[PDB]
């Protein structure tokens, strides 16, 4: 009966859901930017559609506190599928802890197949007025990789 | 045991059995007929319509509904669960389930905004009205598991 | 001894008593209305007798707060019997709560045997200057059924 | 004109109303289909792909500023989710009182999968019971149940 | 002749062999069909309704008494389970050695759903390894895997 | 934990992972390559073929196989169970499952009659022979969970 | 997981299976007996087919030791379905104990719809060299009903 208890839950608002949408929007936005320009004669506006058909995604998830992380990953998958994506075009990578997220994400982003990457994880403590070194490095690494490879990377971590 | 989802499921089970007995031919006589429904769900098909808004609470309500049906001898294979965006469109979805000949009862679960209204609320009044009219027209029990935040 | 303590009570004035009388009066009134007309020559007056011999009744009662509801049901039965009715011609239906009264009453009113229906129940709260949805629906349902089927339905609920 | 286009309209009641219509339209299309084989509890939910669906919109003209931002919010929700602008029918009515009757005409067409109702309501500066607002909600709810076609409610108070 | 018909043949190896063929024929017809939707572990099993299926039987003539009771056992199993006697093809061969080659010819026809092999084997009164018996089992097993069609084994030792 | 059904499931899981790694490109060098399979069943599809003869024992064997797959992270949704009359026709049914592109491994479960044969048994020798040949031809692992009474 | 543990079991040989087959065979046999005769010229043989399409069945099962009885009932249903029957055409009746089987079976056998009845139950003790009164009465009742109504009734009880 526990299978239906867990399957009867909904995963529509967790941070995994919003992280997936941003990746879908940014991936479509880039296709239009590096395509042909407009006809001019008016201000040109660019914005990404939310159709996720024909796009390839990769997800990197840490293993700490897998009870919560598992629910964030399921939220991300649901968002992609419900917007027209195929579960065939998702790659999932698991890592021991938060310190290892940027290096693993770097491997996936260098493949020609993938169009966007989603990073999911849970940080330690966080609720203290102090500078945390692990938190700062993970944010720094993902930001640098995105700018270097010119490929969007979404940041879906939480604190607890 | 103490949530409105549990209570709503029990009412659906009892009403489904009661209807089954009423269609039977009346007794010979010699006493006052008394009709009532028993609390065994074996061999009955159920449908559930739940809203997603304020999902933190409804999952516990849908939890109770499924648990009650199974605990009282119901087979989990016979539950059909339908999800809708908000409470405004529970009645329209419930009507589609109630018209299936393979469904014995329907349970509606949802949450409504605070009840400190000046005099009236225009969305809450339509959910209850629609479900009540639907039950009488189709002659099939529909239970109201909605709660107010 | 408790059997005589409860049996020694009287049930002559409770709302079950008046609900039964209205059903008796209305049931007899309809027989005269759809019968042959008068001879004219003067204003014609119709009114129902209180003789309950040969009439079939049905009672729908909710189960909430059965301590009070049980006494209302006994009052209704006493009224019918004391006016000449037979306990053989009473059908009793029990329902979980007030929300289920109109649907059950609809089933009984469609039978050709029954001549009137009596609804008994106890409502929740009620003593608040606010619009209650369960109370409104139960009143609405019984009113609509009576007009649609052209069969009297009496309304014997109370508040507590 | 470009100043008008630059404003954002994601998240306004026009956006949510259109999004609900897309989900309900897909949900019904699944229910009418063949049932599952069995062997487990069977769950239904509507996808958010809007390609191939036809929509209708009824909007009042009162308070011409607020309404336009709501109507444009609905249209962009359909387009950004895969819909084509050639499959939208727009109807405009003088006021909120006659939304239900116009919505009925659109809903009876066999080429429409869902209907979206947009409007605004005048709020008197003391809380009495409004006899116009109640009739709009009552009328729209009855139409959906009778016609068995989803209708979404997208009005706001001034 | 009526004395021959009066005897019972339920339960002899002809009966069991035919019954297995019916189940396997239905099982394969299910596997080739569309897969289930999902949501649970998916189980397959063959029904025992024989209407609409075509069968072939290969039987040797050695020990003409024993074989006939086995062949008649197979036929009644098909008929009593709904099959028609017009959908059975019977082939007779001199001896057990040439059952596999004849069974191959029947199995290659597109109008056959299963094949049943019946025969008896001579048991020498001391237990040596039989070079004829092993070849029959080896040949029949290879044919079924290669042709992807069920073949049932219904032989006995004297 | 101690039945052949449990052991057969573990072997199928390990072989399925091992094949997945071998198809990967070889390493740069500078050491001896070592290939091995891990014991995590997540994301793998399995098929089971079981015989009905002597059903008292096989149910315990099929019990272990399903329990092992789930305990090691396998999803029960991915198990396909096929039943056949006797052991003679396990190979033909196993071949139909192995040719599906959605199956990673196949487990065969059955029971054979007493092994006090004079020199040889003609039915037992065909089950093992057929499964072995089938695995090599299709290049897919097939596990042998058969036991002797 | 327990749902698959119980569903993975087989029910092919238990007494419920054989009881169902006898009912299927006898029900078909009677249709041929009371039909048109043969052409003669040879000894005429009657025997029942095992096709269970278009036949209606009824099952009476006691409730003592429901762990075992439940498995016998499932065996009976499987036999009917696997031979071409429809689960729509099965009526199931549950009774408190073995003493009540013959009276319940009598009710079902008098309906014109049903073609055969299957009785399932578990007897008490039994493994004693003594005459048991409950066991004797149940066997006697079923035998008498079958001969009186001219309708087959199958006897699928066991001892434990």
What does the alpha-carbon distance between residue E68 and residue B74 come to, in Å, rounded to a whole number? 53
Burial of D8 (0-12, 13-18, 19+ CB in 10 A): exposed
Length, in residues, of chain E: 158
Nearest CB neighbour to F59, from listed G1, G4, G8: G8
Alpha carbon of G43: minimum distance to chain E alpha carbons (Å): 7
With an 8 Å Cβ cutoff, are D82 and A84 in contact? yes
From the CA of D82, how many Å to the nearest CA of chain E? 27
Count of other CB atoms within 10 angstroms of residue F101? 6
Tokens of D60: 């009042």
Work out whether strand G57-62 and strand G90-95 pair parallel, antiparallel, or are unpaired.
parallel
Contacts of C28 (CB under 8 A, 6+ apart): C48, C49, C50, C51, C55
Query: Can chain D be said to touch chain C, i.e. do they have 3 or more Cβ pairs within 8 angstroms?
Result: no
Cβ of G42 and E80 within 8 Å? no
The tokens for E49 are 């309704």
Under 8 Å between Cβ of G150 and G157: no
CB atoms B32 and C92 under 8 Å: yes
| Rounded Cα–Cα distance for residues F143 and F134 (Å) | 11
Residues of A in contact with B67 (CB under 8 A): 1, 5
**Does residue G54 belong to the interface with chain E, where contact is any CB pair within 8 Å?**
no
Is residue C23 within 8 Å of residue C58, measured between CB atoms?
no
Q: Min CA distance, F2 vs chain E (Å)?
A: 24
Displacement of CA G20 from its chain's centroid (Å): 5
Tokens 């249903």: give the residue.
Answer: G77
| CA–CA dist D117, D133 (Å, integer) | 13
∠E1-E4-E10 over CA atoms, to 5°? 150
CB atoms within 10 A of CB A47: 12
How many residues in chain B? 149
- What are the residues facing A121 on neighbouring strands? A157
Q: Tell me A150's DSSP state.
A: T
Contact check, Cβ <8 Å, G13/F59? no
Distance CA B93, CA D44 (A): 11
Separation CA G152–CA G25 (nearest Å): 10
* Residue of E63, E65, E87 lying closest to E75 (CA atoms): E87
| Catalytic residue list contains A130 | yes
For the beta sheet containing D151-157, the strands, ordered from the edge strand earlier in sequence to the opposite edge, are D88-93, D55-60, D114-121, D151-157
CA distances from G132 to G15, G138, G141, G143 (A): 22, 11, 15, 17
Strand order in the sheet with E151-157: E88-93, E55-60, E114-121, E151-157
Interface test with D, best of B67, B92, B113, B120 (most D CBs within 10 A): B92
**Residues β-bridged to residue A159:** A123
CB-based burial of residue G29 (10 Å sphere; 0-12 exposed, 13-18 middle, 19+ buried)?
middle
Query: Pick from F109, D41, F47: which is nearest to E43 by CA?
Result: F47
- Dist. CA F106–CA F13, nearest whole Å: 10
d(CA A99, CA A154): 17
Burial class (CB in 10 A: 0-12, 13-18, 19+), C63: middle
Question: Are D42 and B130 a contacting pair at CB < 8 A?
Answer: no
Distance from CA of E89 to the nearest CA of F (A): 22
E3 in contact with G at a CB cutoff of 8 Å?
no
Q: How far is the C-alpha of B15 from the C-alpha of B12, rounded, in Å?
A: 5
3-state secondary structure chain F: CCCHHHHHHHHHHHHHHHHHHHCCCCCCCCCCCCCCCCCCCCCCCEEEEEECCCHHHHHHHHHHHHHHHHHCCCCHHHEEEEEECCHHHHHHHHHHHHCCCCCCEEEEECEECCCCCCCCCCCHHHHHHHHHHHHHHHCCCEEECCEEC
CA distances from B12 to B37, B87, E73 (A): 10, 20, 55
Q: Residue G155: which residues within 8 A CB-CB, separation 6 or more?
A: G19, G119, G139, G142
- Considering only CA atoms, which of F42, F88, G80 is closest in space to residue E140? F88
Q: Taking a C-beta distance cutoff of 8 angstroms, is the pair D73, D103 a contact?
A: no
Long-range contacts at E130-133 (CB < 8 A, ≥ 24 apart): E132/E96, E132/E97, E133/E96, E133/F122
Q: Give the tokens for residue A15.
A: 């941070």
List CB contacts (< 8 A) between B133 and chain D.
145
CA atoms within 13 A on the CB side of F108: 29
Residues 67-126 of chain F whose Cβ lies under 8 A from any Cβ of chain E: 76-77, 79-86, 88-89, 91-93, 95-96, 118-120, 122-123, 125-126
* Cited resolution, angstroms: 2.4
Question: What is the residue whose two structure tokens read 């809903």?
Answer: D107
The alpha-carbon gap from A53 to the nearest alpha carbon of chain D, in Å, equals 10
- Provide the phi-psi class of G84: left if phi over 0, else alpha when psi is between -120 and 50, else beta: left
Q: Is D21 exposed, middle or buried (0-12, 13-18, 19+ CB in 10 A)?
A: buried
Q: What tokens were used for D106?
A: 């659109």
B62 interaction partners in chain A (CB closer than 8 Å)? 8
Report the distance separating Cα B109 and Cα B117, nearest Å: 21
Q: Please give the radius of gyration of chain E, using alpha carbons only, rounded to the nearest integer.
A: 17
Closest residue in chain A to residue B74, using alpha carbons only = A1
Rounded to 10 degrees, what is the CA torsion of E63, E64, E69, E75? 120
Question: Do chains E and G touch by CB distance (3+ pairs < 8 Å)?
Answer: yes
Do chains C and B touch by CB distance (3+ pairs < 8 Å)? yes
Residue D148 contacts A, CB cutoff 8 Å: no
Strand ranges in G45-129 using DSSP code E only, listed in sequence order: 57-62, 90-95, 116-123
CB nearest C107 (choices: B22, B115, B144): B22
Strands C153-159 and C90-95: unpaired
Q: Could you give the angle at which helices F55-71 and F4-22 cross, rounded to 10 degrees?
A: 40
- Kindly list the strands in the beta sheet with G90-95, ordered across the sheet, starting from the edge strand earlier in the chain: G90-95, G57-62, G116-123, G153-159
Tell me which residue of D63, D58, D94 sits closest to D74, measured CA to CA: D58
Q: Where are the beta strands (DSSP E) in B4-124?
A: 33-35, 46-51, 79-84, 105-109, 111-112
Q: What angle separates helix C133-149 from helix B124-138, to the nearest 10 degrees?
A: 30
Residue C134: closest C-alpha in chain B: B128
Write down the residue that tokens 């092999």 correspond to.
E117
Neighbouring residues of E97: CB distance < 8 A, sequence distance ≥ 6: E132, E135, E136
The pair of structure tokens assigned to G150 is: 């001219």
If you measure CA to CA, which chain C residue comes closest to B124? C133
CA dihedral G127, G132, G138, G142 (to 10 degrees): 90
Element (H, E) at E3: helix E2-6
Rg (CA), chain A: 17
Q: Which of E143, E124, E123 is nearest to E135 (CA)?
A: E143
């Amino acid at each position: 009966l526990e299978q239906a208890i867990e399957r009867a839950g909904t995963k529509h608002g967790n941070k995994g859901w919003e992280a997936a949408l941003s990746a879908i929007e940014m991936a479509n936005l880039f296709k239009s930017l590096r395509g042909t320009g407009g006809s001019g004669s008016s201000m040109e506006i660019y914005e990404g559609k939310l159709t996720a058909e024909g796009l390839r995604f990769g997800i990197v998830a840490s293993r700490f506190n897998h009870a919560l992380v598992d629910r964030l990953v399921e939220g991300a998958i649901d968002s992609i599928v419900r917007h027209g994506g195929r579960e065939e075009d998702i790659t999932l990578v698991r890592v021991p802890g938060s310190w290892e997220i940027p290096v693993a994400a770097g491997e996936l982003a260098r493949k020609e197949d993938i169009d966007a990457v989603i990073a999911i994880g849970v940080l330690i403590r966080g609720c203290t007025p102090h500078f945390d070194y692990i938190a700062s490095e993970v944010s720094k690494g993902l930001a640098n990789l995105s700018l270097e490879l010119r490929k969007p990377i979404t940041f879906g971590v939480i604190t607890a």
